[PDB]
Amino acid sequence: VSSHGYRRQTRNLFSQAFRKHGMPNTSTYLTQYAVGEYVDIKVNPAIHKGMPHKYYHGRTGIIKEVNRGSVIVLFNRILANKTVERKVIVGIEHIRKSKCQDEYLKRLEINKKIIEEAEKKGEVPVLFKRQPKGPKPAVEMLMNNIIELSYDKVES
Amino acid sequence: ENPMNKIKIQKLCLNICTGGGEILNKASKVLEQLTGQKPRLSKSRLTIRSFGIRRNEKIACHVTVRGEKAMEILEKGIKIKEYELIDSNFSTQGSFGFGIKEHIDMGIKYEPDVGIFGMNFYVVLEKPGIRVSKRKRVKSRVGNKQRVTKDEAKNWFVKKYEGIVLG
Amino acid sequence: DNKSKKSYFQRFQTKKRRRRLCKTNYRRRTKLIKLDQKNVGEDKSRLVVRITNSKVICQVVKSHLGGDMVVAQATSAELKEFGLKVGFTNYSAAYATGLLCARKILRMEKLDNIYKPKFCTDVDVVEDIEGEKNAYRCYLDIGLSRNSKGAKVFAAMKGASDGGIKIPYSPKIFPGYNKDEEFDQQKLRDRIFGKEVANYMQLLKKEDETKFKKQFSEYIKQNINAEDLEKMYENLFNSIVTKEISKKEKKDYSALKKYKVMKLTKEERDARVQQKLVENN
RNA sequence: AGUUACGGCCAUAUCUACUGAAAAACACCGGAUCCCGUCCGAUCUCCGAAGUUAAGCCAAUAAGAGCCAUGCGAGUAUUAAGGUGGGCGACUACUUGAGAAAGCGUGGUGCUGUAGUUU
RNA sequence: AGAACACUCGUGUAGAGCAUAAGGACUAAAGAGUGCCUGAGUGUGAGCACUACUGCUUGCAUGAGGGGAAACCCGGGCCUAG
């Protein structure tokens, strides 16, 4: 039978990668955080204070409050077939800034131009949506340089 | 000839081993006379019943001399060994060693309660620049140009004291 | 044993570059620089003091992501502008360099007229004048050098304080400290204005005039005597506070690129090997 | 264009042999009176310039070891969905999709930020 | 003075140690020494582990508090049990 301590089953998780042992780099400590940013959790096994519980490893959430050397992040979780919000305390050594909003922020920068012109000249924005890839395109071909294919390889 | 690139003594190491009680005090007083220093007592690494040694028990005393004082002692000792050494006594590193059985040959008066002890002499030779391997900031390994080799150590001995190195 | 098998090399992890070079302590650096997440707009300045065989360097540095930025700099070798002839790594030259460094800063920030100099007459920390702008703030970075009573790094630090910058310090480190008694500041003043060396010069002339010439040749060439030092140092300090050194000019030393060696091409490397086989057979 | 002080990413930067280097630096170097610390002025701390490019730091060289990239291995190994497909089983063919690794070949061998100094 | 006594020089990515299972962590240290101290303080909040008890993480205020030149750290034991 299995046990139920705070760091159960973390032999693979919570171990350093090959040729990457030691303390964190300066960039870790010089990064500034703000309320409302999206942030991503990855535990550093060498630091023993401010570690989250291993369920949260590799998950992304939103910063709710900022303190001297730690952050409070909001998560959601299913328990007993219902949704529950959870507020997780994490030290700054175990977090990295998330990339999940990157494309959306670029798209907002384009929208922000159009939405002004749409008051002056038009009435409503064109709004620049994405579209999924359509059907295969048409082609005009010169028809020299033909290559033949054959079952010449007998494959003993 | 090229200055720098010339051999010197960097250290002479002296040790007496006498496992037991008041013997170590009696011994220490000898080292305290031969050189103007207070020697360092050393302790047993293992426990060995046959030799009469418990672990962490004091068993020996040593002192390390440098500079002018080193020259006097070495000359005083090589005389006792009559300027005769064997090709066994030299290392691949530019160092050499010998032993003496009777401390009174170094000249001190007997005092029958103190006793008779032997002593080990070990000598380390050098050329300038060795500091590069010992300083705190920018510490680095020395060049092969600036080591002392087995042949050079023999040549220096022959030249300096006119001794004879037997095969 | 170790270095005899390939696996030793295949599994090895290198230290960071400035650690291999024995120039930086990362455990110390991180404690010194790490950001406080609530004090937004705080921008801590390190005072970096380093001592070479030739000179003393003071730099004021701010640590930013991507690389440290130098705000200002001063070097004991520049004191030759104000007539310093001798002892560029002396305890006095340490103090003087810290003084110079401070003034250059407070001029850029325009605090210079508010926070006046104060030549070594107390051991208190610099205090914010009411109704005016706050003092410029810094912390001391001594690197790999040891802290002990009367180390030259602390001389430069007192220089900066006397110059008007706010550094927190404890008097435990200065000469003239006593374990359970008031501070004897005349001993400190004595060293700043060079008494320690005068007292050595005076001794040697009674002991051994040969050794004196060997030990102090450079001083002799300037006709300086043990008696002259206080006047020398008082003038030096005043001049630092009073004057300003001329700006540096920029020049293209570009043409010295002639001296740079260039690596062999592939074509050459191959022919060279070919010839080596043929020379051997 | 190098160097030097403080750095960023942490081997294209490591490890082993050899060889070069104008200027200014960087060093080795000469002492212990003081402050400071040792069994020991070796290390650490202080006060110095008589020497020296021998060393370190920097740079080149090597059908070098190791690291980094790419091509091939290879539509190969394994695998999602499907049928009144096959086989006593062990397991395996086909249809619509996703898709490796080791080895071995070929090329590389640090790049950059702020300030200071040197034709 | 021996297989195995003390002292040295060169190599040495851990082949050692870290009181007590097993795993993880650690190299100018968290290991081995040396100095000083009793923070193994005092009030009162918010949370994490399926969360009552329990264990841990973290906020603000105070001490004629500690260690350190200082930045920093400390309301038990390197982390996961007693």
mmCIF file of N, CA and C (backbone and C1' of nucleotides) in Angstrom, chain C residues 247-253, chain D residues 115-119:
data_model
loop_
_atom_site.group_PDB
_atom_site.id
_atom_site.type_symbol
_atom_site.label_atom_id
_atom_site.label_comp_id
_atom_site.label_asym_id
_atom_site.label_seq_id
_atom_site.Cartn_x
_atom_site.Cartn_y
_atom_site.Cartn_z
ATOM 1 N N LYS C 247 37.858 66.963 -19.475
ATOM 2 C CA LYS C 247 37.133 65.869 -20.107
ATOM 3 C C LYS C 247 38.093 65.052 -20.970
ATOM 4 N N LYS C 248 37.758 63.773 -21.182
ATOM 5 C CA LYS C 248 38.555 62.885 -22.015
ATOM 6 C C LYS C 248 38.111 63.055 -23.468
ATOM 7 N N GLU C 249 39.067 62.917 -24.402
ATOM 8 C CA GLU C 249 38.806 62.966 -25.837
ATOM 9 C C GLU C 249 38.665 61.544 -26.370
ATOM 10 N N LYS C 250 37.873 61.391 -27.442
ATOM 11 C CA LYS C 250 37.658 60.111 -28.106
ATOM 12 C C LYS C 250 38.490 60.064 -29.386
ATOM 13 N N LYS C 251 39.175 58.932 -29.616
ATOM 14 C CA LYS C 251 40.057 58.744 -30.763
ATOM 15 C C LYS C 251 39.910 57.324 -31.311
ATOM 16 N N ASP C 252 40.042 57.170 -32.636
ATOM 17 C CA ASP C 252 39.996 55.854 -33.255
ATOM 18 C C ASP C 252 41.396 55.265 -33.285
ATOM 19 N N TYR C 253 41.647 54.361 -32.337
ATOM 20 C CA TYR C 253 42.847 53.541 -32.370
ATOM 21 C C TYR C 253 42.627 52.338 -33.279
ATOM 22 P P A D 115 28.890 53.782 -21.908
ATOM 23 O "O5'" A D 115 30.256 53.749 -21.067
ATOM 24 C "C5'" A D 115 30.509 54.777 -20.078
ATOM 25 C "C4'" A D 115 31.461 54.262 -19.025
ATOM 26 C "C3'" A D 115 32.945 54.571 -19.247
ATOM 27 O "O3'" A D 115 33.287 55.910 -18.853
ATOM 28 C "C1'" A D 115 32.680 52.323 -18.545
ATOM 29 P P G D 116 34.408 56.721 -19.686
ATOM 30 O "O5'" G D 116 35.778 55.920 -19.406
ATOM 31 C "C5'" G D 116 36.620 56.379 -18.326
ATOM 32 C "C4'" G D 116 37.717 55.390 -18.016
ATOM 33 C "C3'" G D 116 38.930 55.379 -18.947
ATOM 34 O "O3'" G D 116 39.820 56.433 -18.596
ATOM 35 C "C1'" G D 116 38.280 53.160 -18.429
ATOM 36 P P U D 117 40.451 57.295 -19.801
ATOM 37 O "O5'" U D 117 41.706 56.423 -20.296
ATOM 38 C "C5'" U D 117 42.805 56.150 -19.389
ATOM 39 C "C4'" U D 117 43.557 54.939 -19.888
ATOM 40 C "C3'" U D 117 44.262 55.093 -21.245
ATOM 41 O "O3'" U D 117 45.568 55.668 -21.137
ATOM 42 C "C1'" U D 117 43.082 53.024 -21.151
ATOM 43 P P U D 118 45.970 56.664 -22.337
ATOM 44 O "O5'" U D 118 46.536 55.686 -23.481
ATOM 45 C "C5'" U D 118 47.884 55.152 -23.361
ATOM 46 C "C4'" U D 118 48.020 53.924 -24.225
ATOM 47 C "C3'" U D 118 48.097 54.193 -25.731
ATOM 48 O "O3'" U D 118 49.423 54.404 -26.199
ATOM 49 C "C1'" U D 118 46.569 52.449 -25.290
ATOM 50 P P U D 119 49.685 55.758 -27.029
ATOM 51 O "O5'" U D 119 49.063 55.485 -28.482
ATOM 52 C "C5'" U D 119 49.914 55.729 -29.624
ATOM 53 C "C4'" U D 119 49.741 54.620 -30.635
ATOM 54 C "C3'" U D 119 50.519 54.770 -31.950
ATOM 55 O "O3'" U D 119 50.883 53.494 -32.462
ATOM 56 C "C1'" U D 119 48.192 54.911 -32.379
#
